[PDB]
């Protein structure tokens, strides 16, 4: 285990990760109804690292957001309507019926 910081290697990647992953820690955002149930700090760190590191940044950002949403659902909190703004594509990709 080294001590790399992927967000420091790219300005645009860091900007994208900060803009789209900070919604996890935003108390007045789509995920604000869960801060009492699940602490979003670890999920925010995972979001930043994954978005800055992996080539498909949107995929890793969506994975981190979905992981936080699943943890909230496990705790009993529903955050429906959290895909407005980002991660819209999977909502329009399932089969015809």
């Amino acid at each position: 285990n080294s001590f790399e910081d992927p967000c420091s290697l790219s300005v645009e990647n860091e900007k994208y990760a900060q803009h789209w992953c900070s919604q996890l820690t935003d108390a007045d955002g789509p995920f604000g109804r869960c801060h009492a149930a699940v602490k979003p700090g670890t999920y925010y760190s995972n979001c930043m690292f994954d978005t800055c590191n992996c080539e498909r940044s949107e995929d890793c950002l969506c994975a981190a957001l979905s992981s936080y949403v699943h943890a909230c659902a496990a705790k009993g909190v529903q955050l429906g309507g959290w895909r407005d703004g980002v991660c819209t594509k999977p909502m329009t990709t399932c089969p015809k019926s």
Partner: protein, 58 residues
């Protein structure tokens, strides 16, 4: 104390020109016709990066 009396310093210069011609700091000259966003030069030799330059063509 570091002494340097040789004005020839092409080793500290890297450049790109013409139809995707790149000259590295070490004198290597090649052609890479890439139109994407590439890291021209960044300071990866330390924990803290002093500089990071990227160039994009069209």
């Amino acid at each position: 104390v570091v002494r340097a009396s040789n004005p020839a310093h092409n080793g500290r210069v890297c450049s790109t020109w013409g139809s995707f011609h790149y000259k590295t700091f070490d004198g290597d000259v090649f052609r890479f016709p890439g139109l994407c966003n590439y890291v021209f030069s960044e300071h990866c030799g330390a924990a803290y990066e002093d500089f990071n330059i990227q160039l994009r063509r069209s």
